[PDB]
Symmetry: D2
């Protein structure tokens, strides 16, 4: 009773009576993630180092792989990449109805020191009948059909959230299959870890400043929270999902609108947190309700266990 991702997606497409265009897209996504995972684990590196006698940095190659494999699903009309200034309009022969927003290799500062990196994606349905253009990507994350990420960590995991729930799949690289290892994931209501880059403590607003303080010096004299900040949003959000706690990347003054991008970092991760029973907020509003105006717009985000996120939203409220 092994459920593979291939079996799971097809079963879901059949219960939903899709024409199979969305199933084709998700199957292409699973193929693109396995190919990236293999290049990230450095298979074939001996050839660069001349094992047979005698370039593509991993993020450019992860980008070429997601664009090609997704264009050949015949299921997308618009692609937005973290790595590309403009939205990619798929050629008419290869068009389908979906819009995919992705970060091809997340945790750019973490690539060379070999810490966990990952791929983040969100899928929208084209809501118009005109030529595909950037406009089709500019939808609130509330409109996502599916979103998720693949983590290339000690093992590779693909986490997929759709209307029905969040499920986690582990890649068995011996057979190239993702196996369902966690069905219907729900985040703990309260965690014990907070995750933020405190080197920006000087630019933090008073509510963040107050909340961190409370985590280190708890008023009630319970144990302080542990701190963890891997530096790759994928890696820090996955641990928040699996262990609980809170992850924050607020507006500071170098990034006054936050550093993380809305369509392919914040919205995918916000949708997974909400399908898992957590909250994802800007501090003032829910991330999935923002209507973007630029495909590379930034938003501050705080996401994680609902009691921890509620505790910080109450501090935001008493500072107005």
């Amino acid at each position: 009773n092994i459920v593979t991702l291939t079996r799971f997606v097809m079963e879901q497409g059949r219960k939903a009576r899709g024409t199979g265009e969305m199933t084709q897209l998700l199957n292409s996504l699973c193929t693109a993630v396995k190919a990236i995972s293999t290049a990230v684990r450095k298979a074939g590196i001996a050839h660069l180092y001349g094992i047979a006698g005698a370039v593509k940095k991993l993020d450019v190659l992860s980008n070429d792989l997601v664009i090609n494999v997704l264009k050949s699903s015949f299921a997308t009309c618009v692609l937005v990449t973290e790595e590309d200034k403009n939205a990619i309009i798929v050629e008419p022969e290869k068009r389908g109805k979906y819009v995919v927003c992705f970060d091809p290799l997340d945790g750019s500062s973490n690539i060379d020191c070999l810490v966990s990196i990952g791929t983040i994606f969100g899928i929208y349905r084209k809501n118009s009948t005109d030529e595909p253009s950037e406009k089709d990507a500019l939808q609130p994350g509330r409109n996502l059909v599916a979103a998720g990420y693949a983590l290339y960590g000690s093992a590779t995991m693909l986490v997929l959230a759709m209307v029905n729930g969040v499920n986690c799949f582990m890649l068995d690289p011996a057979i190239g299959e993702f196996i369902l290892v966690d069905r219907n994931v729900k985040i703990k209501k309260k965690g014990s870890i907070y995750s933020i880059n405190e080197g920006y403590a000087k630019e933090f607003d008073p509510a963040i400043t107050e909340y961190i303080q409370r985590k280190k010096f708890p008023p009630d004299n319970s144990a302080p929270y542990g701190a963890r900040y891997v530096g790759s949003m994928v890696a820090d959000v996955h641990r928040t999902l699996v262990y609980g706690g809170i992850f924050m990347y607020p507006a500071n003054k170098k990034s006054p609108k936050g550093k993380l991008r809305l369509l392919y970092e914040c919205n995918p991760m916000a949708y997974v947190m909400e399908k898992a029973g957590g909250l994802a907020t800007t501090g003032k509003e829910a991330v999935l309700d923002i209507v973007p105006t630029d495909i590379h717009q930034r938003a501050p985000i705080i996401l994680g266990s609902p009691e921890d996120v509620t505790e910080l939203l109450e501090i935001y409220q008493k500072h107005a």
Copy 2:
């Protein structure tokens, strides 16, 4: 030309005119690290999920692979594991002269959320003419013949430090060969990242507190440091070696002698840092000079780029 770890170790053994007993040992570490890497990446997991009809949790397995493959080398007499209450004395039939101190899977809290984990090891030459015992492991780190670690991060890397210097080997998993990618590694003199678990801020001593303060609000008005703390010592020490900066786990009033263990976490990493041109101090003395009195003794450690560690030792001096 492709220098594999097997070619490198055999040539270093030839230069040194060793009998070949330490080359057999280093070759046995290379095999155990490859077998742990494959298990960590979850190859064969489908069989656990019933793919063929019809769990040695990853740290017990890593522990069992290092002890067995190292007894089979005929090169060791005493083995000290993070996982083991007592020193393991190798049966006289497999007995050789080296003492191997190791942490088989570091970053215990990070195993389940799939963040980078790793193996740490230090090798001593047995010095007594007595029967092998715990005592042959209780040598200052200054007496280490070789030390290093394997990081199972986005790719698997082995870093080996011997008298000659520090060399980095990348595993090419397609051929099961460690390839020399970075020779005679030297840490940057000053970095821009500090790494510490700030959840313990209530229990830090005043030189640590003052130092974190200067990193966040620089008195000379230079730019603040970035913060990173993955939570696995191997991953944080490895990013410190490759990018620079400082890593700290001081005594807090929960772990008043520090948390990390001297024989198999602090001494191996101190020895690597020192052969790469950096420092490793308790804040009061050099880690490699401590005379161990217990195989599971703990020590504080501060390590990293020479200028950053020196800056903290200055602050430690204006407070005593």
Copy 3:
């Protein structure tokens, strides 16, 4: 423009407007073949040999893997295995409409000396509405919906024939995907290799005896045919498919009805040869037209390039 087997099967199921039950079955088949290929290449063998301190012969395990993965496709009601005396009736919860006939590891005498072995399968649609029983498997191969084989040779290849043609897919074991490498395969009209076990020359009928003779001593004094007989039907039929020539395993007197079994050796391979433009005959009739009476019935078979098979059928005719 890579076509993977997953993309190809789904596209074909959509053009045919299947409910997706056949697509699910073929996706399970692709997962079962990858798992067998990995166990055949001996991944993990170091664990039998005690790498970590401390049974299922490859054909019993290949059998357990095909039965479990096919039962969990929820698409089969009857299974017939080379290795099982009785047909397997799938439990009602897991039932679907298809009947699958398979040889789990072909070339039993070739397993231990490591020569090419393979998996052979044929799929029928249940043509009745009564309880599944052996009767459902007893259909002429003319009724096959899909048939094919996976060869675990120097590389792993899956050859799949359905009404529309024969296509060959190569496993890239680095990502676990089968990639379409040969579309719409057609066998050469005449080949230059004959494949038969000549150690039975004493029991051969006069038409076989005459035909071999003509291959070694050609009347017209052209070049003799080369001989090849790997000993695994999969391996010998695949070379016949790809290079042309003829493969024969006639009735001799130890196997007076031939040695090869009809439902899971002869019919699958006969269907592939006919979709590829070749012939497969008993010598008297076409193999796919035999109506079987026992699920483990044997049939002689001669298959391959049509001019070569016609030349031997003309000799059969002048010996009556």
Copy 4:
């Protein structure tokens, strides 16, 4: 306990008190065979089929991997390849004392239909005090220091024969390690399989003809032998070593000096057969005693179980 090939070669080198130059060489063969095995199994093929948007045919690549990884050993002075018109003299900077004769990918006709293929090698110690030349390769096979082959069949196996005997190592591709699975291999005294290309029956001499006749129609009325002929010498010789029997490629009147080459096909396999207790004859003399006069010279060879080869030498004597 797990004996890897790296552990075995290093201990044999220690027993023999070698300087370590032949251990470096055998370790370089183990690495080149792992890299050819991965290429043969087609890992990374998706990249050729455009998975990332945007061939060194397998024998050229195998050739380039053996020469490069062997020059990098600093252990060879002359290399003779099946693929190379002339002997390769290693640059004085990489020059050592051994002469390596090899066939990089044997079974050229079988590469495209994916039947077992393999690598064959023989190592001589250079004997002249002269500048290295073709001449140091022209030594009788009796002067070989080590010989063996790698078979890329259903699993990858390395068979190594040195003075001590023949040992078989299975590649565990999950960890990239060759594991000792069969120690001091001895061929059966009499087998029940004969292997020859009978398509040449018109050109065989009368002792071969008579011998095949006795195998098919036994005069003492014992059971006929089975016939097997894969078509790749490594695969057929390997099945002869493990099951027994006889392998023959006599001179036919197309190849009157035989087809297989003395330095890198016949001598390596003869040396393995002899260390396993079997025979290797041209029909007239022992293969290992022939004095080569050309690095690409051909010889007939008959090899296999002692009683079967002796039976054929008897027939060869009643005809001259």
